[PDB]
Amino acid sequence: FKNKTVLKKRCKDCYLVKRRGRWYVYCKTHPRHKQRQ
Amino acid sequence: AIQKMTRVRVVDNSALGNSPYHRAPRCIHVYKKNGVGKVGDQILLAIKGQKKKALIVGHCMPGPRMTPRFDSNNVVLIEDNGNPVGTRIKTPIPTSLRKREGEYSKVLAIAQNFV
Amino acid sequence: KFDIDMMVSLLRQENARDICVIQVPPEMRYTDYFVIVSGTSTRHLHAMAFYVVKMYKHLKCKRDPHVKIEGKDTDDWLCVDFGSMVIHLMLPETREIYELEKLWTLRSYDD
Amino acid sequence: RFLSPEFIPRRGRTDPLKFQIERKDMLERRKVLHIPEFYVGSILRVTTADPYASGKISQFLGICIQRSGRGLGATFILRNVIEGQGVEICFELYNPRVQEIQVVKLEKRLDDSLLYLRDALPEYSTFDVNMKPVVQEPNQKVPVNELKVKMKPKPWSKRWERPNFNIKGIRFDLCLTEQQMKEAQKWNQPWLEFDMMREYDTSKIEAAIWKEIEASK
Amino acid sequence: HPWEPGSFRVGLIALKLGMMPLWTKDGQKHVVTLLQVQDCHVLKYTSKENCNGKMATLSVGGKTVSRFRKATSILEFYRELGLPPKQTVKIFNITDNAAIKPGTPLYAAHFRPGQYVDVTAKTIGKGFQGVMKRWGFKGQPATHGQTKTHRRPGAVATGDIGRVWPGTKMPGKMGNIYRTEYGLKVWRINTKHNIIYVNGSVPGHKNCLVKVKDSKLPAYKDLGKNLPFPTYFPDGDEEELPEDLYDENVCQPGAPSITFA
Amino acid sequence: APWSREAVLSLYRALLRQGRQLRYTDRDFYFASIRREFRKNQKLEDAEARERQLEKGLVFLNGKLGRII
RNA sequence: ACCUCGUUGGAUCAGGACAUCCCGAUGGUGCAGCCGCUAUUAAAGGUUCGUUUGUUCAACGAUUAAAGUCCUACGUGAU
Ligand SMILES: [Mg+2]
Ligand SMILES: [Mg+2]
Ligand SMILES: [Mg+2]
Ligand SMILES: [Mg+2]
Ligand SMILES: [Zn+2]
């Protein structure tokens, strides 16, 4: 994960999910895209 | 027990050990978390204005029973890799060196006498 | 059993460039057999030492404690200490400069 | 009759049952290993099995410079020089791995402790490794070697000339000035040989220990 | 009852006789301490509800003492029990499987060699001690101008809090408090004199009563299978035990001198 | 110079004789080592070192201080 | 709007923060394993000895798993 103030989807498979209280960008294809609010 | 600044006797065939010098060889560092070297511990020596590793093979401090106590703090010069600098050790070497953790087979092979 | 016969057989099988054996008398409180073997290079020394150690580990004597490999960091001299025999692997220059043969055959009759 | 020093207990509040148990173990070990009579100053050869080797014995010959400890842990430290290197080994008498204790030369010295041989000349600690055992007559008092050793220069392991050591086996006249001897006399403590409450009477204890040993036989 | 997993049996109250060496077949020397079980009896039993917890309790005493020097209530208690009074009474937490009738004696063979044990006793009292001896403080240098402070505590707190924290290490009474040594191996048991040879050191002085119980360490959780579960009963006479029970590794005296062949 | 002229030769012969039944070591290396020991030194010593050299050779022949097997 | 210049450590004992130096757990990596780099979490524990310098420091030597950044009226001098 990379901590970002603003979450931006990078590829098509990047999806926003609110988990354990905060927003995340997960991605199956590109785990490099993993972002945490 | 050999600490920093202890003067030590190089019991070895090496030129560094057998070469005369104004300052006697003196322990500079004991490669042990407590700065106390026993038989089998490595130390760093200031010999002839040169820093050389060495191995303790005897000391005046009493150890556990059945082990020999020497009249001097005997040390053997070794290289950084571990090869003994000299090729012959004249004074007796304690046999307790064998089972201690650490490489001592080279020193035992070089040694002439055991006590 | 893992004995000097197994040792020499394994060493000849891996083709040590030179092998010598010394029968240490019992009154000398070190061991029974003093094996000294030369090799082509540090890679060959490491390979043969590893092979003989694996054979010792796999062969027998589960009650016998495991055995170190000494001299790994240095390249020109390795050594392995077993219960009753010690092997010294080295290069020809190391062997000729340390003359372990004269030491271990002539205890106090050399220089 | 010689009672080995380790049998006589140092005084204390320890229960006599502990000493009885320890003496039982000591005698039961002596039934296996013959612990000969010897004194500080007698030359001994000790053969002991080495755990570092595989069932191989090691022999050390030297002059017993100190007897110490009581009970099963009793030790004697004996000294020699090997290739000019002074060495001392403190052997445990009842260690199960001492195969044999041989009194090469049974003799008593002027002192009950020869720790000053460290500061004496190396000849007084040198002993041939292969020296043959001497023989003493069966009915004969143990010889007392009145040898007075010569000392190396004054910096010593201990201030041997001080009266608290009560050393008789050193030639102080050779190495110390009369002024130095007089200065050492400042620590005399003459009352210490006359305070009667300091003496430890072990007659009854030795008698009981002898009864125990004879019963063990 | 037979032994079950999770069962805790009673311990003993022994007397520290002293220490002696011992050797193992590997050639190593272990110092061992002798604990003599002297007139140790189960005195009292209480259930889980009134045990100040949730485990049955056995009060056990040892080292019979003079009736002339005990309080009337203690004398009455021991009169009802039918036993002479004991010097110290210690409470052992047990499961109901291990309940033993009060008055039953306890012996050193209640333990067995190879078992691990916990020994708790009052440590040697050293009186009011300074901080250098009590807590191993470094003190101050002997010279170079140091005056009247060599063994004193330095600062005892920071200036901000304007106070001294509770539990601050300060000079005071050292020792004479109960301490427990855990995981000590039982090397040997003299059944004749009821001696337990326990590995290493035991808190307290010689001839002091120590409380001995099965070790609570997790490694030795279920080693009680082969131990006499309620306790050892010599009256049972199933097999009269030898004079000395040894651990396997112990170099017994009278054995031929060990050779590392 | 040596103890006797034939002592060295007899010792060398006995060394080769006991190398005849050599079992575990390298026979070629053993012979090469003996040749080195007896050729790199025994040409131009002084009359005093000959006794030490032959004594050490005899001790090695005896093999009480460790023998080559 | 010219020049200048206006109480401090150490020792002892440390309390605390985490913005973590090491030890722990994870995500990613322009890391195949080894590794390094980066980020999240983690303050239970630990965090060396010397030479020159009064050094506050700094450099150097030898180590270390690491030789953390700080606050505590130099933290602490009725020690
Ligand atoms: Mg001294
Ligand atoms: Mg001090
Ligand atoms: Mg003062
Ligand atoms: Mg954090
Ligand atoms: Zn993506």
PDB file of C-alpha atoms and ligand atoms in Angstrom, chain E residues 132 138-142 150, ligand 2:
ATOM      1  CA  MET E 132      24.954  -0.262  45.379  1.00  0.00           C
ATOM      2  CA  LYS E 138      27.394   2.097  39.857  1.00  0.00           C
ATOM      3  CA  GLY E 139      28.005   4.666  42.557  1.00  0.00           C
ATOM      4  CA  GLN E 140      30.564   7.406  42.054  1.00  0.00           C
ATOM      5  CA  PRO E 141      34.320   7.301  41.376  1.00  0.00           C
ATOM      6  CA  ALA E 142      36.694   6.901  44.296  1.00  0.00           C
ATOM      7  CA  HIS E 150      30.856   7.062  46.551  1.00  0.00           C
TER       8      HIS E 150
HETATM    9 MG    MG H   2      33.417   2.175  41.936  1.00  0.00          MG
END
